């Protein structure tokens, strides 16, 4: 994530503890602006995934310690901000396909990450 430029490392972590249903696998890091966008909703690694723009990869173990990573670098020159990271975290998708859909609640209001 950041701060601040052009592509430094890490600083996205929350939330411990009891981060949600472990279904293999889940969200939600809030995501995003909030006016957007975004983020086509993580899988699980070799190969299950993934997000909509390259180098957006996410990885973590749903066992304890329940955590997250990275995230991530990525391309930040668009001055965008999601600085938290709080859960419940409905159905991801992937699992999903109700069809879809829906998203109950969230937590931990504004955290803003600099450009």
């Amino acid at each position: 994530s950041g701060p601040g430029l052009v592509q430094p490392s890490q600083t996205l972590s929350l939330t411990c503890t009891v981060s949600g249903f472990s279904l293999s696998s889940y969200h939600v890091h809030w995501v995003r602006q909030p006016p957007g966008k975004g983020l086509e909703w993580l899988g699980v690694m070799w190969n299950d995934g993934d997000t909509s723009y390259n180098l957006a990869l996410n990885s973590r173990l749903s066992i304890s310690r329940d955590t997250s990573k990275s995230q991530v670098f990525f391309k930040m020159s668009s001055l965008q901000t999601e600085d938290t990271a709080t859960y419940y975290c409905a159905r991801p998708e992937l699992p999903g396909l109700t069809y879809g859909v829906w998203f109950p609640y969230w937590g931990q209001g504004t955290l803003v990450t600099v450009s």
């Binding site: 899988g43 995934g49 993934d50 992937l94």
Partner: peptide, 9 residues
Amino acid sequence: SLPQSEGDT
């Protein structure tokens, strides 16, 4: 027909 893009839906 075989799907295309990586990452899944």
